[model samples]
Target chain A: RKFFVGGNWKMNGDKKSLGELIHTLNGAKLSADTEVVCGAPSIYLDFARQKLDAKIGVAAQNCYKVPKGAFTGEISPAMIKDIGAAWVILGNPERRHVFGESDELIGQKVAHALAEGLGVIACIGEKLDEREAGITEKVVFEQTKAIADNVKDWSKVVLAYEPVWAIGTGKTATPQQAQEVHEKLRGWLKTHVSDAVAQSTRIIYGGSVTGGNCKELASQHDVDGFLVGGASLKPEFVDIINAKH
Target chain B: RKFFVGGNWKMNGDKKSLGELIHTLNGAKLSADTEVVCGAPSIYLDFARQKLDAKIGVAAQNCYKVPKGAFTGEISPAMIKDIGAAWVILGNPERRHVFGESDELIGQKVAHALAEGLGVIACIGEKLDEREAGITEKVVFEQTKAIADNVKDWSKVVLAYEPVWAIGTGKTATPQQAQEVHEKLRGWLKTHVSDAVAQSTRIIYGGSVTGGNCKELASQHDVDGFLVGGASLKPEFVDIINAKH
Candidate 1:
């Protein structure tokens, strides 16, 4: 399978800058083998949809578990799908650690989005303290297990490992460090789910990844692609997409 | 101003049902004098805009104080304004009582919305026990005072008094009881703001307003309009709209 790359512009992007960002993406040459998706705030989805290249798909940063109704100040999966979003980034660490979104809640959201025919980039990872305490494997296993139990199929789901400490902190994980976690995650998937799913599912890393270091990370056996953050806002995003080319 | 009736379909309406609701409103021969706006779940705003009548305006149930960025799972006033939403309901008791939204925070939202040339239906009312204890005036006044201090102009603002006890409980306030509070609010406004501003500003009542009791309540001296709850979902929403007529 070709590599899959996604950019999660978490709570960033203004009107003027978003237009420029889109213009940059439209002018860049993306690899035909790679599938790229950009997750923007719900408010900017329509704006992004209008300006982005047709080859690149749009995603909502997050969506409520409920399909629709009075969960005041919430966006639903149905609404996201209705607005032409092909995928949604679910269970990002910020939603789990900073906000009060729980593992069970995220599992429900993943199942809902899958049922609605929307692809999900489900994120799971450990904090710096947890990793330092030698509990990284345990934390990732716990989060992944919850979703595996809830979701019946894994054909449309991609797993992203974004250590909370490295995101937006200019601390990109070394190739070996990313491989250790990705290989461990794949092993866990083989035991908990079917082997087919374990092999087919793309295991991506996030956390201040840039064109400068994406090639080394992409060379790892288990690192299928990347979920780029800051670098995705600039021309370098194209470089990350074509890291393997 | 004509009698203003707003339907806060708070967190309610799925894709299939939202379309039906808009169809019902469009088919109904609503009075020209009454202003009808629906506070849909933010997810449905785009859908509501596409499906609802041109005569009927859209409202967001709640919005963040900031114009944009960083706050995930939130809608901004700029977003509401961009979608052609003329009014935004701020500090609904549900948002305050359930979600821990403060009056100070709501005041900021009102200020920003008005600055963007959008209208605001600023909600304020006491809880059941506070109303029973005759502290309704004190509670309501304190809430309104917060907005009065921050908002430079009251011309684009509407006050929605939704007593917590009467919302969704089938417990309707008697005409005399409602009128007494409405009269007191008018008096309070006159004392706090100029007489012209007070007279011109619309003071609407919310909390279980229905077709059965709307007429009697409409006849009261100070009761200007309504912010209908469950009744807004029904065909009788038209009757409530035509109550003053």
Candidate 2:
């Protein structure tokens, strides 16, 4: 399978810097074989779409659980589609950690994200407490299970594994740390879902992923690609894209 | 003192409809005496600012409680300011009811909004349950106190009173019903904040306000203007803007 690199700019990019970032991405020699996606704040998605290279897919940073009406500050998947984004990043750390979302709510969001026929990056991760308690497997299983039970179609689902503690903290999972989770997640999926879903589903890694660490993470048997964060804003993102080379 | 009217486009409105709506607003014979403000979704604020009439102030439907950081899917007041939006709607029913923002958090967001020198239309009202329990005064006062405690500059603040039950249910308070609350709120501000604030700060009504009801609501002494919702999407919005005329 071709590697997938999803860049979640996550609440930080404004119009000008984002334009410059897209300009640089446009000018760079990106990897042709790798599938690349850019998830940005909902406010900038339309402008980003207009400015970004046609080859790079765009995503909404998050989406509401329903189709539309009276949710006020939140945007829906259908609205995201109307704005020209092809995917929605469900349960990103920002929504889960900062904005307060439950595993159950994210599962509902994934079901609706799929309902809109938008591509879905369903993020599942353990908090620092959960990870230290040595229940990472149990947390991921519960998180992933809620999502898996709701998803009738696996064609558009990509499971994103983000360690809540590692997000925005500069600490990263060692290659062994990352693969052990992915390797086990793969086995869990095999038993819970069909074997085809376990094998064919894209299991992506996130949390402090950079050009320096991406190759090793990507080289892991079950770690399909990355959902890059801070590196996505820098020219180093280009290097992360070409890590396979 | 100028009567203020804000059109809260809420979670609805695409770029095309928004452009059309702004075009209609520009051509309409707006009452110069009425202070016009438009609260569209944060995503469209930048676009709307460019397209909207210069006379009409632009507002973001909501904002985060900080200047900037990693609260994903949440745009901050600083970011709103950077994007050129001068005002933010805080403590909105969509935020409190659908999204679960406590009064304490809305208070924090208002503090940041004021700290950034942005205009504030801080929403305060009671749900059906609370209204039915006859604690409407208690709820509004609590909502008001939380926000007023954080606000140092009352010049940029407007309090929007939205009856949660009437928001989209096609039920609007009678002129007496609306005035009673606004009148009490006026007295409360005088006692709690200051007499000058009570006299100068705009106390606008929301919740299903349309052209049909705005004039009646406006005729009341304490009902300054409105923070309009559904009607804001339609051409009747212009009439509501000119309700006093």
Candidate 3:
């Protein structure tokens, strides 16, 4: 699998700021081996698609399950593709914890987005107490099962394991910690799904990953790349993108 | 109060379709007396704002309570303002029931959007069960209270009464039925808030409103305007816009 880096810009960045960021990204000497995609706020998905270099991909941070309807405030997978963007981030922690998106809903979103030919960054992660309760594996596996069941094509899906405790908390999992989870997820897929999927699918770590910590995290055999948060909005993101090189 | 019409395009229309609609609207001779606004999906708010004539205002279908944050999929009122869109529709039936947005959350969003200097199309309505049970006034008034408690200024707020029973169901309240509800809402405002607010605030109806029915509906003294749904995406929307004439 090629090293993949996804910038979950979250609910941040207006057009001017994002445009500047796109300018920075377009000019940077990024690694050819790394597959880079930036998740822009839905409002700017089209702007990012139009302004960013074609080498980089634009993603809607989220999308509705169906193509179109009266689901006000939601952009559908079809609309994302219509804007010339090719990816969507589904089931990110905020979507699950803050906005109360169910595992089933996330799964449905993944299926629909994949069916609509948009690459899906399907996110699954356990909460802090779940980790402390020692049910992290059980939790993520179940979450993974929901997304896995909905996925017909693994090639268009990237699995992002963003620990609830580490996100924006200034705390990161040690490289060993992330590797253990990533390895377990792969083994779970290998046992339950297919070895082809387990081998080829990209399992990226996300949680307070910065330029300072990205190299060691990326060095882990199972840590294909990162699903970046805060640092994604900064210049250091370029360094994280080049970590594989 | 000025006659106000808002096109709640909801989750419909891609850029191509919306761009064409904007072109049609841009060339049409619309009534200068009616305050016209179109609520585009968040993904297309900027597109609509840029393409539509300055006379036609652009509004977001919905927005989050804060300026900006880690809320994965939600756009903030500040982002709406940054894009030069002047209005936001909060607590529409789809947002309240389908998306499970609480009245409290909607109120907070209304407050924040107003604080950010954006006009608000704060929507309140009763479900079929409530209306059938003869608690329609109670239900909508309660929803209104939640939004009203958070509002510091009435000048920037337009109360949109979109009944859950009527929205997209091919069933619209008769002109008399709509006028009764609008009159009661104004009375509720007069008794609970102030007479000045009751007189000044525009209480627009939204449901299965079509060009054919808009004239009689607009003839009602208290049926100030409309928050149109399906019809807003078509050329007939021009006729609906001219209904007040």
- Better by DockQ, candidate 3 or 1: 3
For residues B11-114, could you state the per-residue lDDT of candidate 2 as single tens digits?
78777888899999999999979999998776677788889878899998888876656666878776787778889988898789778899888989898888
Q: Total clashes, candidate 1?
A: 4
- Model 2: residue A205 alpha-carbon error in angstroms: 0.7
RMSD, model 3, all Cα superposed?
Answer: 1.0
lDDT score, residue A95, model 3? 90
- DockQ for every model comes to 0.35, 0.65, 0.84
Candidate 3: list runs displaced more than 4 Å.
Answer: none
User: Worst ten-residue run, lDDT, model 3 chain B?
Assistant: B65-74
Superposition TM-score, candidate 2 onto the true structure: 0.96
Reference-based lDDT, each prediction:
0.83, 0.87, 0.92
Residue B222 C-alpha lDDT in model 3:
96
The pairs that clash in candidate 1 are A69-B11, A69-B12, A70-B11, A70-B12
Q: Candidate 2: lDDT over CA atoms?
A: 0.87
On lDDT, the candidate that comes out on top is 3
Q: Please provide, for model 1 over B93-137, each residue's C-alpha lDDT reduced to its tens digit, 9 standing for 90 to 100.
A: 877876577888888888888888888999888898897787988
Better of 1 and 3 by TM-score: 3
Query: Candidate 1's residue-wise lDDT over A95-141, tens digit each?
Result: 78655688988999998889988899999989999989999999999
Q: What tens-digit string does per-residue lDDT give for candidate 3 at B1-245?
A: 89999999988998788989999999998998989999998888888899999999999998998888898888998889988899999998888888899998998999999999999999989888888899988898899999999989999999989889899898999999999999999999999889999999999999999999999999999988999999999999999989987
